[PDB]
Amino acid sequence: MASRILLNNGAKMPILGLGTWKSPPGQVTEAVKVAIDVGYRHIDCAHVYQNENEVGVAIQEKLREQVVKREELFIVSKLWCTYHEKGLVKGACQKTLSDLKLDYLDLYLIHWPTGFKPGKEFFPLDESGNVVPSDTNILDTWAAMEELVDEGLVKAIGISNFNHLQVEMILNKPGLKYKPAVNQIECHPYLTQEKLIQYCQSKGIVVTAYSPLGSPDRPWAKPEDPSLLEDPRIKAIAAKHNKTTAQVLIRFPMQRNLVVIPKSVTPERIAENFKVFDFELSSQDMTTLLSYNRNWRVCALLSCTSHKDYPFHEEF
Ligand SMILES: NC(=O)c1ccc[n+]([C@@H]2O[C@H](COP(=O)([O-])OP(=O)(O)OC[C@H]3O[C@@H](n4cnc5c(N)ncnc54)[C@H](OP(=O)(O)O)[C@@H]3O)[C@@H](O)[C@H]2O)c1
Ligand SMILES: COc1ccc2c(C(=S)N(C)CC(=O)O)cccc2c1C(F)(F)F
Ligand SMILES: COc1ccc2c(C(=S)N(C)CC(=O)O)cccc2c1C(F)(F)F
Ligand SMILES: COc1ccc2c(C(=S)N(C)CC(=O)O)cccc2c1C(F)(F)F
Ligand SMILES: COc1ccc2c(C(=S)N(C)CC(=O)O)cccc2c1C(F)(F)F
Predict the structure, then answer these.
(1) Residues 151 and 90: beta-carbon distance below 8 Å
(2) How far is the C-alpha of 166 from the C-alpha of 256, rounded, in Å?
(3) Beta strand pairing status for 42-44 and 12-14?
(4) Which ranges of 126-213 would DSSP assign to H, the alpha helix?
(5) Burial environment of residue 138 by CB neighbours within 10 A (0 to 12, 13 to 18, 19 or more)
(6) What is the DSSP string of 278-316?
(7) Which residues contact 23 (CB under 8 A, 6 or more apart)?
(8) Which residues are listed under the site Lowers pKa of active site Tyr?
């Protein structure tokens, strides 16, 4: 398996990266350092994860140690919902860059299509339990993202949690300068996303799969929720290969020509999770895992369902 995939901006993106949502500041510097040591080159970051400073320390240390050079790293971050106004986008990106201690990002994504009220809080809600939106739209934010490419701050721009009609709005934008390079979406055996994946691949847009292990540390996990890592049918495939269930779950999107970003702050798991280039899931494994789709999301974000740009009402 080739370890990078070609983007529509000409750059090559590593198909297996390290996720950092919920990685505590106190553990993420070691996590990123060990990830780089064992071969990860792609780190998936976000301002809202509130640990970009500590990710930055790790990257800077590995550059100083001469373990990697900046050109070999693929660093991704995301524009948070409260910064969709055009006049706020450059500062949001530069805050990330300054916290990461980088002078460019390889990829910058609109984190969610939904703009939130600008201000200090990240998840502004009202007394009904619903998010407080901003008067921003997808096209104007996308234009602001384009400016970041032209000023040299990011090498590629993309989107996350966009449904196919929202992607099409950008592809159809009057005077579009850069197509999205990537759509990062939830994807795993219980949410296999065939239709949205087909749409994006048909357009030349690479898909990144998030929460590939089913995000068992997500704050809202409930005991009755299905659990990928404990699913006996996936254990049985793992057993056949003398691999772990996580390893099966990571290799699965790889063989669908997706990028995947499993998260861990545990050095042993970080190393295990990267050890997926030495086996192949069979055609039976692959189709059996696809057959487990339930269209079930760990990231539904029910607090956002009234937002005009909530992405998961459409079929895909
Ligand atoms: N764009 C967005 O809207 C969005 C949304 C969600 C996630 N993401 C990205 O996708 C990344 C991955 O998703 P996620 O963080 O939700 O969850 P995930 O990667 O599906 O699962 C992470 C969890 O699995 C555990 N784990 C990791 N490797 C393991 C292994 N080999 N064996 C057993 N347990 C293991 C981790 O524990 P420890 O860390 O304690 O080891 C943590 O509890 C995120 O961190 C983020 O970068 C993006
Ligand atoms: C800004 O929002 C944060 C920030 C940090 C987290 C964490 C982090 S990294 N911690 C609570 C720190 C720690 O585990 O020590 C874990 C789960 C959700 C988070 C969230 C979330 F909003 F998802 F709840
Ligand atoms: C779970 O909710 C958390 C958890 C942690 C944070 C942090 C973090 S990661 N900490 C204060 C640092 C730490 O816990 O070590 C920063 C800002 C908002 C958070 C939030 C918040 F929801 F407020 F956004
Ligand atoms: C779009 O709405 C979102 C999106 C993400 C969050 C998160 C985050 S940071 N995640 C689910 C992780 C991510 O989006 O990468 C945490 C708490 C509330 C959220 C909300 C919301 F506030 F509305 F519930
Ligand atoms: C653990 O901390 C949580 C947990 C859940 C939320 C939510 C909710 S209820 N969800 C993300 C669940 C959902 O909307 O589906 C919205 C905003 C902030 C949250 C936070 C936060 F800390 F960010 F305030």
Answers:
(1) yes
(2) 23
(3) unpaired
(4) 138-150, 164-171, 194-202
(5) buried
(6) S----HHHHHHHHTT-----S---GGGTTSTT-TTSS--
(7) 31, 49, 51, 263, 265
(8) 78
Nearest-angstrom CA–CA distance, 316 and 307: 17
User: What amino acid is encoded at 29 in this protein?
Assistant: T
**HSE value, Cβ hemisphere, 13 Å, CA-based, for 304:** 20
Q: In sequence order, what E strands does the chain have?
A: 4-6, 12-14, 17-19, 42-44, 74-79, 107-110, 157-160, 182-186, 206-210, 259-260
Note the resolution in Å, 1 decimal. 1.5
CA atoms within 13 A on the CB side of 219: 4
- Nearest residue by C-alpha to atom 17 in ligand 5: 123
Residue ranges of alpha helices (H) inside 162-266 are 164-171, 194-202, 232-241, 245-254
- Residues paired with residue 18 on neighbouring β-strands, in sequence order: 43
Nearest CA to ligand 5 atom 21: 123
CATH architecture of 1-316: Alpha-Beta Barrel (3.20)
19 lines ligand 1 (CB under 6 A): yes
Residue 259, beta-bridge partner list: 208
CA distance 178 to 155: 11
Ligand 4 pocket (Cβ < 6 Å) reads 21, 46, 48, 81, 111-112, 114, 123, 131, 299, 301, 303-304
Q: Which residues does 97 contact at the CB level (< 8 Å), separation at least 6? A: 103, 104, 105, 153
Atom of ligand 1 nearest to the CA of 112: 3
Alpha-carbon 129 to chain mean position: 26
